[PDB]
Amino acid sequence: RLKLLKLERIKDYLLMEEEFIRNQEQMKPLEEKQEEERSKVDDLRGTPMSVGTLEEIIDDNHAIVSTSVGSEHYVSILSFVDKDLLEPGCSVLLNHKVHAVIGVLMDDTDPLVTVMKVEKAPQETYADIGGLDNQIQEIKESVELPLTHPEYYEEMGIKPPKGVILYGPPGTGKTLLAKAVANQTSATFLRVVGSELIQKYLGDGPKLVRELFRVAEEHAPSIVFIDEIDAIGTKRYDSNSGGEREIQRTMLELLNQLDGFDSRGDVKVIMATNRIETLDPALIRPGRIDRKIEFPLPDEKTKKRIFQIHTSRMTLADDVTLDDLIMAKDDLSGADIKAICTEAGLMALRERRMKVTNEDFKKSKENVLYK
Amino acid sequence: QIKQVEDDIQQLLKKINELTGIKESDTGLAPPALWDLAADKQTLQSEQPLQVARCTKIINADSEDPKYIINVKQFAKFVVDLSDQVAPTDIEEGMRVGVDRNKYQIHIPLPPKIDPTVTMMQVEEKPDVTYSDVGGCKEQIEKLREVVETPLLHPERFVNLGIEPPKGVLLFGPPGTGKTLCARAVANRTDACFIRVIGSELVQKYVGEGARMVRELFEMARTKKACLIFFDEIDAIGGARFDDGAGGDNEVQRTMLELINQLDGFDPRGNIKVLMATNRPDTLDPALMRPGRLDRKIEFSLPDLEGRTHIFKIHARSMSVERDIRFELLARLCPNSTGAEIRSVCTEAGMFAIRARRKIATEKDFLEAVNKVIKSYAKFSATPRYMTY
Amino acid sequence: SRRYDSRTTIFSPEGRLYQVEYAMEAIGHAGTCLGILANDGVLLAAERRNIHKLLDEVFFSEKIYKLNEDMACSVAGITSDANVLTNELRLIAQRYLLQYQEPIPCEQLVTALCDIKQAYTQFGGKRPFGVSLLYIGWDKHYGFQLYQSDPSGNYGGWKATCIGNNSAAAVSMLKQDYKEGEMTLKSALALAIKVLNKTMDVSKLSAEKVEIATLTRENGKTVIRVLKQKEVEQLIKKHEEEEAKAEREKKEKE
Amino acid sequence: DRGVNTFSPEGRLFQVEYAIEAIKLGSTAIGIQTSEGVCLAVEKRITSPLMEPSSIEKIVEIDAHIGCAMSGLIADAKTLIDKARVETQNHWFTYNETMTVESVTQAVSNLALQFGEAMSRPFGVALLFGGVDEKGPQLFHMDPSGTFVQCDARAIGSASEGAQSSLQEVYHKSMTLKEAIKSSLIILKQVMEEKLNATNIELATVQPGQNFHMFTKEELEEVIKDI
Amino acid sequence: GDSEVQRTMLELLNQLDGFEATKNIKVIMATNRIDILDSAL
Amino acid sequence: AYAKVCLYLTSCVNYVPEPENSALLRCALGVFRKFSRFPEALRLALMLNDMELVEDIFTSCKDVVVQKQMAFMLGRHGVFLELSEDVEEYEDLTEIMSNVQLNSNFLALARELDIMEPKVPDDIYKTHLEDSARMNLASSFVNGFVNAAFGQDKLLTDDGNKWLYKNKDHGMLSAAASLGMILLWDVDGGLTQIDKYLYSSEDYIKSGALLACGIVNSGVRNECDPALALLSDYVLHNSNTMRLGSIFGLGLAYAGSNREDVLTLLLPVMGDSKSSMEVAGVTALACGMIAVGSCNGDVTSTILQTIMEKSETELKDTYARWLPLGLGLNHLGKGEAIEAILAALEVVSEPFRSFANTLVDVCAYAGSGNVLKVQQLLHICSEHFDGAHQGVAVLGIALIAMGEEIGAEMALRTFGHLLRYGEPTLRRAVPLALALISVSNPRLNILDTLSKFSHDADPEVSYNSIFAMGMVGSGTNNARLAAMLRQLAQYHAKDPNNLFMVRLAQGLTHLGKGTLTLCPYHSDRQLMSQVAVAGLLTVLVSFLDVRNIILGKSHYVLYGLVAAMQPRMLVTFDEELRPLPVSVRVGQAVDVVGQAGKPKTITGFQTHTTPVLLAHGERAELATEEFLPVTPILEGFVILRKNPNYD
């Protein structure tokens, strides 16, 4: 077949390659054998290799390396190193006696990277969400669809939306869709918060924003989820030395990172809030974030769906009617519904039964949903 | 035989690796192709390491045998002399002397220190945006092009008339009008050192660290022959100085004043041309706005009807639109809109087509996109505030 | 163009009146008040935030005022705004009486005061009256009536309702255990007592911490009487007996 | 900036010009004046089929010899129309004659900047007063700035720029009223967001003779068939 | 200013609300006043 | 059905051993003729090298417009069919075949994309942001490359005697032929300028102007025969001093024509032996270029006699490499047939054997993809002599493997390993072969490797790597590569012997301000151009020894590079040869390969109005179904008809 002949035209050149590689390896004069070269590398790299910063690169075979003690040795860089992955500020391995650049480092990631990355799939899924059909559709079109079927967008000739805002009152499924997207997506999920962006010293906020988005690029394809972005605003903290204006400069750094000079890689931004009126309109502009999607309080059908979802695992008593909860005609949220169910279970175990009852649900009403 | 062929291919790859070099990236090692051991042994046996110091003073600078006071950073200060391979004139009283160990004399003159943060600002990879990707701001493009490119491309037409071209521009306008887009276009089209700076990148935690890196940025630009600097989001540090009573913004005002003195002070600023991108050109200091520092202020006002039609054309060039476009109708239907709004309209038309599972975007899809991006999102618009700003 | 204006009567990015709703939540922080309708009469209970020991008793009421012969109101929120609103209510009722030679209907008086409320929420820069009213009255058109009006100038007719602290819990309880074509004054008083108990759980409903006013009809006249400490203590004792009996029955069943 | 009567550094009331911005959001009205009369054709933006098209009143009768085509904000338009009608009737009552189009337009325009802190903001409506008076047919354009000027052919509204470019390309001083209506409908159809169907446009004519006349559906259909 | 303790609670709770792989990390907080507690908490 | 068949047959032909490729091509051609897809049939016939079938299909074509577009395609490939005087529009078809009007079309594209403003060498150098005869030579070379085919400049079209005299020694020839290449592609009115220069008192200048005439006529075909006249008049009697300009100009001018008159004029000057070894080599080279792919017995025989006659030490001396090179160019792509020539060369001489044998073998198996042949080459590579045959062998792997999109990248990997494990000559040669395997095709591993090894200690490896990187960027002026070449100029500021190569790379990268391509293939990635591959192989085999050929006095081979200069064009024409500016979309390559999914769908849509200057690997299809294209593939000039079905 055509593909079989392609793979054969690959394997034959490969066999040619091993033939040549062997031939040369043996006619080498008992030297330069890959293992022999590696042993010579070990010999010339020294038994200890100090880790020091690379202050600047002057040219190939030369560089200024700052030792941990502060000395600034101008020293050669040997053929061993790739002469790549070397940028000012990088770690470098230095021969103990001559301080020659003989390796590079930073194979490990930072605690900030570890905390931001979500090295797990949240158990919540789109099936565990009831009522947010349009919001799910739009967030999928923004985050998942361009990753799973880029053919649609490439054929249509458009680029997918870069950002999405989930705006809604206190508890409507915004972080829930964030969890579902993290669960189902194949991209690296980086979670941050606005109060978590508000830093203490001057210049830490912008530095953290830059670090977060640099990590997102390094781990691209990535989804950066900034929950409660209005926390960078509404909330005021004394730890913040600069104050309102340092907050403004952090917001400006966010502006630049979302849409600035540097060309972004594959980093889709999700950003959630319940006070979207306090956000800077420049932050929300279409180039930085389009798809501002609302999360209204569930209607009667959606509330019924929430109760079905959150009671699917509870052994509701035959007399229990999951209809009086909905008939309670207040600003009931999905968070309220889940808390009512959870505290009903708590009273069930308190009063020793494994089956939840109407009285348990009513006292849960009166306890958590204080109305 | 397909699976046999893949198995053989991977076994062949494994053998090639096992006999050439496989995995050495943990300690940032290189593939063994460019391993010149014969040369590196002579390098380590013939090129001694040099500790970097600074020549503080030249005692007896006259032709008589001089002496140089070096200050090996954080190590010690010494009186030393030059290597016989180094000419006296190659070393001044401020150059990084670069002296060896062991009778610290084997000199190598060494350039000024640059903070890694500052030096990681040169635009190495040029943006993929061109001047043809910007529409509706023809005069702004012409003026910015003049200022930044034309002196750097054909200086003869300027020295013939004896003109000093304007050196400094302020691209100012509402959020999303082509400011950063035009900066990226300039960076792409320019053959010179382009250094991007972000206003938030000049906020540093220790007093005199913002001004320090402003000085380092400008002196690196000076070391380079032809440099364009681009302060984006200049609102961050550039703000009118106010006395207050609690010393607020003293540090940012100090770094701004350092930038002011570097742009126009008691010194020839050099062959540096500066761009200032902003959407709040009402906080900027009057000294910063003085035409000795921002010569060619340019306004990226919201595009008119022709500009909006041109932007729609630009953003729909590569789309799968149908026969009849009526992008002029779309432009009149979405007035006082930004290029960001227009690109979002085009994208939303494409997404409506995709959602309907069509491969052709039609005028109805575009009208739905306009309704979604211009009308429904009208409450999140930044123009009503930033036009006043 | 003023710097000090504060723009009291503007709309918000969303059609949500900030001053009116801040007044609403001031009502919420204020003391609790509730009203119950019943075929024989209407009643209005009210928590007291003047429970200090050195505080004298000089009026016949502190949360409850009389508007005219057959109508009373109760205020939640700000006491001074409540006083001015009650004075205006009395003026409106007496103007209607002077004009038509008959008592103002309850809905008409509520509508007049709510018109004043809406005028303050729309005109001028003055802050709205942070006061919520519960009116209980009688008139020859629909007999005993209960109304509840908010700072926004919105009023609604209720069979049983509550304003002030924990008003949401009180109204939920009334919804649970209020009977429409039943519940004469005796059961209405019992229900008000139990609602006040579960609304002021912090304190076990000391008779001095609440005030109850009952409006009824006798021989064609309307009588508005504030229940004395004796009667309030009797009602609290009866509720405590009933609660103890219910707890004993539940425990015995278990 | 803060306040309705603040001047911009360039010389600009800020509120007249925000009103101009508001005008650029309205339907497209086109007025032409010719020796044989004045034509006024205005797009009637019907958003739903359930909207009675006849209830969209963008062409109004100031008097028997003056009509007004409004664009921008129709309620402010209506206020100005009521003022114009009252002024014309007052002038007739006092002088026993008819307001000139220039006189009525200036009387209406003198009410355009009478706001402060009465009106709190300018009128966000642009008007085309097409009338016939002692000196023949005259079309006057007024804008929120209160500056009125009589034009041989004007096009206000969202499609103002393109409509007026086409009016340049087509209009000539020695044309007939029939061809003026023809060209106005062609331009209005070209700039129309939907198809021109004879129920989504208002056409009116003021001639040296018969009073201000608003074309019925039959005449509109005849002209639209002709185009 | 606002409460750093409440900030820390809110961030830790945001993590634990499904973004934590581990299952046995409980969060307890102590306060003197109930009303002043942040509406987010 | 049709798609399945044709696509599978094409792919298998590219990916199949020698014996089955011909049969698969026959059946592919049969299917195309059965379904009446005449342009496809013509493409298959040309790639088969079946001039008889080409004539049969072309004559069977009775549509005037389709025949004219076939004529355009065949002219771009390079062939001059001797059509009889009874066809559909004989004169128009013949002139289209001759490729005239190319000057007008190129100027029209320049005007549509304004590039007529001359760019002086200093403009591209941009020295204001970062010697002697060497710099003059480099500046003239880059000026010519950048202003090729425009007939416009600022150095020579203006006061030009100053530039000529600033150039020294062979710089005279350099400048004159640079002017020729500036006036390339049907500026035959420029015979006036080049004649009023060759009316000179200086031998170098006069011969360089003769070479300029030859190069201007290169690619061109004029029935007036504007080259043979000048070339014969100058080369008839003076066969003692230099003659290289004349012979080379004739060869470059005519190339694929294969005209017996020029063959029989070039053969005696080679066989006389009174002309220096340089002239003999250049004459064999010109014969090969004239007859790129013929199995021509006369050329083969004369080359064999020349090799036998030349002394042993003469064969040792360089410039003998061009005689087996000429023989290979003659036996270009003919495949196995060469066995007789291989045996003859084997019995000719022992040491010159390896060189001549490998050169002819690789130049005959160019594009075959014979894995066993490449294995023989790699065994020759493994056997280290303790070198010229080594270098030509590496060039041979490149030449034979530049046929498959997979084998090409794998040969790039093999070249990387060859440089890793190589010897001096092997490493010196690898950059040239790695340039051949990718020409005018920027690739971010080729560029990186060549840039890395430009700094290499070995000066000759640096020379070859820099020229190779310029080659890869040829006609594709790229910001990254231009900045890289400027950085290399800064690096080797002092080294003139290498800065000359850096400047040459800069100019060759900015070729024509960016209009052309030196890639041998064309159309849709499988159509070898014999003339172009001959020119490229000439230049690279000459560079195999870089110091004594290019850095010495033999850059007329750099000027022979022009044999591969063809444009990246998408001009569209009316049925009567008139411009038709039509919206056209562009992109690189996309599809779903299910069964035989065509890779014709393009996703990088970029609407343009013809003329369009498409890049390497981009397919441009029509914007709307208003015009039908007679050619299934839109490359080069096209004739578009009005779709009678519906606009």
Ligand SMILES: Nc1ncnc2c1ncn2[C@@H]1O[C@H](COP(=O)(O)OP(=O)(O)OP(=O)(O)O)[C@@H](O)[C@H]1O
């Ligand atoms: N005039 C324009 N022509 C084409 N595209 C435009 C134009 N204006 C904006 N855009 C689109 O919007 C984005 C460019 O916005 P840009 O980053 O330059 O905004 P800005 O004016 O710097 O605003 P900000 O204040 O938010 O930093 C790109 O998506 C570009 O496609």
Ligand SMILES: Nc1ncnc2c1ncn2[C@@H]1O[C@H](COP(=O)(O)OP(=O)(O)O)[C@@H](O)[C@H]1O
């Ligand atoms: N369909 C739903 N709508 C709203 N909330 C839901 C739904 N399904 C589950 N929840 C519950 O809501 C909580 C998430 O609320 P969240 O979106 O974080 O609100 P916010 O982000 O505004 O604080 C989860 O604890 C989840 O169990």
Ligand SMILES: [Mg+2]
């Ligand atoms: Mg949340």
Ligand SMILES: [Mg+2]
């Ligand atoms: Mg920007």
